[PDB]
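Form 12-C: Joint structure prediction
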Amino acid sequence: MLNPIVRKFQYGQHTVTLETGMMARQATAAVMVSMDDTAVFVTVVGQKKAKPGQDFFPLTVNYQERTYAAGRIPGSFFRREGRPSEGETLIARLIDRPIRPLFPEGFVNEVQVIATVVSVNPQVNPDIVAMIGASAALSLSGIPFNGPIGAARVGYINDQYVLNPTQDELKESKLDLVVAGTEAAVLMVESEAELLSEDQMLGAVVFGHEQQQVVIQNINELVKEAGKPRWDWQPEPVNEALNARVAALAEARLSDAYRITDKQERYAQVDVIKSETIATLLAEDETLDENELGEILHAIEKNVVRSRVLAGEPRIDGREKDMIRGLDVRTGVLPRTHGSALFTRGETQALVTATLGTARDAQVLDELMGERTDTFLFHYNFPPYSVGETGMVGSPKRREIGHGRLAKRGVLAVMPDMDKFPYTVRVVSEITESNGSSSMASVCGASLALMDAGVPIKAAVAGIAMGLVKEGDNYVVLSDILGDEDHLGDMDFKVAGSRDGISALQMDIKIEGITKEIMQVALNQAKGARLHILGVMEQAINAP
Amino acid sequence: LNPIVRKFQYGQHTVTLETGMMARQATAAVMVSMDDTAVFVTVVGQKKAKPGQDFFPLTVNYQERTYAAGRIPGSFFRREGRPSEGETLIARLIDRPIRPLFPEGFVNEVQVIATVVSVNPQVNPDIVAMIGASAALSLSGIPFNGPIGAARVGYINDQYVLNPTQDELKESKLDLVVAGTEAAVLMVESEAELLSEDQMLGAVVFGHEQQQVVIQNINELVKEAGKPRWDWQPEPVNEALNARVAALAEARLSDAYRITDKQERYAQVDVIKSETIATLLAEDETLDENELGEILHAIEKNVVRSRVLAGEPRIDGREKDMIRGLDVRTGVLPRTHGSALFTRGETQALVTATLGTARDAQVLDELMGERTDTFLFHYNFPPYSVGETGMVGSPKRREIGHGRLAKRGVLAVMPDMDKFPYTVRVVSEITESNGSSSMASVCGASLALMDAGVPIKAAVAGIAMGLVKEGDNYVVLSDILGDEDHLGDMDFKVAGSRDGISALQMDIKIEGITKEIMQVALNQAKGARLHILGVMEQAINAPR
Amino acid sequence: MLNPIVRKFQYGQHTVTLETGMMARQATAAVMVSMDDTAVFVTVVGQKKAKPGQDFFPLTVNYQERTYAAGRIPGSFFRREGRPSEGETLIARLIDRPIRPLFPEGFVNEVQVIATVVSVNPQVNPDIVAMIGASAALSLSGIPFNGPIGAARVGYINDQYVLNPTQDELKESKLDLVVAGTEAAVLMVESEAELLSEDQMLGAVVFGHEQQQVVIQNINELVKEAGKPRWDWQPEPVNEALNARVAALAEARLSDAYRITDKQERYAQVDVIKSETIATLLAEDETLDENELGEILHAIEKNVVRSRVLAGEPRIDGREKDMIRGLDVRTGVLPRTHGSALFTRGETQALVTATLGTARDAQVLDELMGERTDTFLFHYNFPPYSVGETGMVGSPKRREIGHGRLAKRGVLAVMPDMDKFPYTVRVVSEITESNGSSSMASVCGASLALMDAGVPIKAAVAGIAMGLVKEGDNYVVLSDILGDEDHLGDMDFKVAGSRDGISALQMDIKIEGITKEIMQVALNQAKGARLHILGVMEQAINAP
Amino acid sequence: GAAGGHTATHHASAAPARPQP
Amino acid sequence: GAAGGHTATHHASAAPARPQP
Amino acid sequence: AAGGHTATHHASAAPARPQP
Ligand SMILES: [Mg+2]
Ligand SMILES: [Mg+2]
Ligand SMILES: [Mg+2]
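Section 2 - Result
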């Protein structure tokens, strides 16, 4: 006979129900999570064996909304749910982003998380529910995972923070923020705001992190009851002798390579060093693992860059910790477009256009929580030539959908309403060059393109990405990070807004133990950065 | 440029087979016609097998051109695109009977392409396409133990009717398709209005008897124009290597198949296979890995098959006619119109019912005429149902096929529009799989429809029957496991109420199935579904 | 940052602007080209090192139109540009075809060209602009490339040649021709004409080739100022000892193989020769490169066929240089179709149908230059069975769209106008057999299918493909070429038209230094060829 | 407020069995 | 009602040939 | 004509530490 294991708990003004043990017993773990009539069925499958020559962690999160959850039959020609919509892709990223860094370094077994919305209360958003589901399922599975995580939406009504506000309550909110993290630290923040201050945005992150602790505690109590035994998994043992042989051939060369400021040169040299080092070690011993040599070489790169940041030495491009790269701002670059702009920050460049249209042109979104028409469209394209590569030119990638939405949230706060400006507006950002943050270059480029098109935005809007290097209690917050400083650093911390406030805040933290003080240094240092960018933008164009 | 032509009467129609003039570069090509309905069928078999190939790659592509009906495609690009659900279903009608006729061991890539080039709106192209594939394969010289025939059987005025027209089917209590060789039935696909076991068996026998004229005429066409049979042999029996594998594995695999739990059994079988291959490869590194897996598969097969024939308890301890444990639940999701969770052993289906209006009815732009559908049935098979990872994109062909099979099992009890004027969508989510999942969808649908308040005439249920047969000795199995399907001789699915059969599906993997065997299977299938219906009644016996 | 390097020049009645150095600096080269407000941003990325075991040149051209160029928001449900339309696919081919033969023989590094239309003047076609952009970028890149090429559209108004006519001017034109080539020779021609003579068509090619020399001169000057250093690239050093070893095993056998006239039998034997030769050499020395052995074998094939053509010996099938293959023409081949035809020329066969429709059936084209309704539809299918192969049967591929449009341009000139015959007409060509030119067979098959359907076309229409083998000043023009004669020859030269003129002319030349004389001989010899085919077509059906 | 098997509005179950005569 | 080339309402053919000059 | 050379308005700044 089937027996469900059920834990219920209060979370704000809602009841969260967690059920496991009777549905999908062949998955590594499966949980049915409900928050007042809104239910998501979440499963995890982790493969026991890693693939022969695997050197990257294959994690896939699939989020899918069934229309029977709302008592409706799909509006499409086939009357069936198909490829994930823009909304389903974004929520899949909301689940993926906080869980990814919690898998141990070296863990490369294939893991798949599938979340299916099976019931919906039109006042309760399934995204928070699905995130609690993924956390609970991963914690019960026994797969190496340093959770559990919680999830909380924070609003701001009457200058007071509100936990998981309903769809009706968000109409009065000056903020829509989602925060996920462990018992100890915040891992992911996604938000849009109506130009709130640095203190108001930080208080929301802290509030939501404190409120979601009841979710973490209840998953912990469910895990002690029904959790499967934790996998006997070990990282590959440290080979000190092989490290020394790689360091003897490469460290001194890689140290000089990471003082080359030009991106194209500096790789081209990094690749020569790695090729020559590996080919030399294989000439000595043909049985050596080529993947393992790449991981040791990458460990050297990381150590070279990180320790130079902590020592207070000049960064890869010669900059100091709080310097912004060179700026070039252009307006009216294309002759037949309604509004165009070319924004260049260092080796990152965005060709951004604005197009005015009519009702006809507004997007009809057949969403699960209720049909909605969209007047403001924001599309972000990242072609492979922006980083000097060749590749597919198919449909938009998940990263392109995510960054198009982030840049949209950075602009929405200053957009005129329908009474003031009764037109459909489409903004397209073409990333022509990339070396860090391209989505923040899209924010600046959009602001110039909208003004060029004569769109009466409240004020000019701009953004940057902040980085971090942290060992123990020691840390350095980096302004306007390069691609390398994002990949070898500890966070990507994006802030967008006008002169008077923050329109969007996004955090992607790759470590545990991020601190309130650190997030505040980042927010203050970010404010100075965007005021500098806005000043240059003002020189070019200051009004429609 | 001369066509070789053969004409013959098949019931009330004239069938024309033409070969020799068109597509002379294909291995074989046949233009088949039945009273103006024409299908051009080609076959290409590759001379060499891929060096590391271990499975037979057979592909059937069925496509309907709109110029066949004097129509221009209704789609935005005015061109035929990806196959519809109907075209996918007919492609499966061709694949299922031909697949088991290729010799065991034969792994050369074979592709069959059927193109409908002309259509009489009273003559269905599916039977015509099946005859074409049989003719082309028999002519090709590709190792193929055909030819097969094909027949649709109706039941009008309590009499069997061969290939009834579209108008005649409207008065028929049966729509059955049967395909097979001169000796035996291989494939059955049917929907019926609750007909008896004797009525359903008589239809299979009738259609198999009537289609012999098709087989006789293909045989005569092959004598005239058939290309010489390929000089192909299976790999010779290596008695010494078999004994070496048996010495390491037989006793361990015999014990492994006494483990009832699927997950525990598969894990143990994998360990046995992994250790046997690793040991043998250390003794001799040049031993073929695919071959060792083939010998290991033959041992499993022999262990399971011989225990069935000897009258010993099945893998899970059951006797030949025992049904697995049942768990039936209704009203499991809070916001859905009707929901059910149906569990049979290690097979589970989460099924929902949704009500809509005429706006929600599906419009099918089909070759034989435009048609609107008020009853929708979708079947989803995620990889976590069997504890695996995988691509979740667009319904696979197998999902489409099982979604239709489950629909045909429910259709007989659905109320018509005059009694319940609503569009009904049924979605079956397979959460666990170990055999038959489509029949679990039939039961779950019946429960979900009653939960939604749909006024069906009669609860409906189904099961899959199995077979183990050596010579004249055979054992018929009730409610088969996944292992009993793969190592067995057939998958024999029957759905219906207490009063009759709504759907009958046969997929037979051997030649030499008998009228008696089908009779025993049908009778034992009846007791099985009556037992399931009894448990279903205890939960719910009338619509909400 | 540094300003871009800009070069302007007059090109006919327009101003062309070339900008480089500021946008997309991480691409190998990037150019913004403008012609009176029509602007295309073209990038090139060529990979530094070739993939370890590559034996084909991977060149990809991606052409994409952004709707913000015309001040519009996309009309699709997602309000975003998706998969390339037919028009975008055709223009990508216009860019690909002339540039492909200019990369050195043996160069196999991955090259990608991406052209994005960012601005559009509705009178100035972006296709010529994009071609100039691809030429400028490839020449600036430093990638081994024997350009630069020019590009010109030639019209014919008041019996005079007109350079790059506007969309309004083209309404008065009896010709729409596009020609591209180096300073020395023509490389690509794509055209449709209202039954113009051989001299009128040849004059258009020469005119367009002379007029585009100003574009070539200006790209050369821009390369002088802004061109990157030429890649240090060398072909594989010739191995004479290995050449003689392969020739000793294969040359005599391949000489006999290319006297086998039947295509299936020839290929079968060519494959056996190559398999046995490679296996014999890898048994002597297993360290030999298999790809290189394949390239030497292909070189022996090429020389055997080419030298036999130059010596004046009978062709592979026994034909003389100006002989057309055997013909078989059939009408009313399918019962339910409006008009059907089966056209056979040798081993090339096309089953062609015609379907009549209403205004509802006319295709709506959401083109960048203006929305447009198409009343004449031509689709071309090339299934893998046509060449005795297996393969995907998904959607149309880049060539299927290309040949479908070529065949459409061959028939357009004789079509009745909507004023006299107000119906949507769809023509579908099914290639059942292929060994030289299918798409010219589609032209013939369409002419017959349209007459069979009762479409009052002005005259019957036909076509052929011409070949060439050229060494120094010695050359031979081949009529109705085999697939082998196309692949081992120097050109594919297609001409379609009635008894009174040319409806379509297409050139794909693989060598530099093609001559006005050769093109003239090809055109005259092509005329006798279609008059011969039209004569046989007349014997079957001569009026609707 | 909750989904899942514990919420079943109706329920029935049977152990593995051989059907009636 | 049969399909194929044996069904053609009109038919014409020619051997391989060099056309008139 | 298109490109950054055809800009209607333009401004630029060298790498800098912003005033706090
Ligand atoms: Mg960044
Ligand atoms: Mg089964
Ligand atoms: Mg050709």
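Section 3 - Comments
The two ends of chain D are 44 Å apart (CA to CA). The CA atoms of residues 3 and 9 of chain D lie 11 Å apart.
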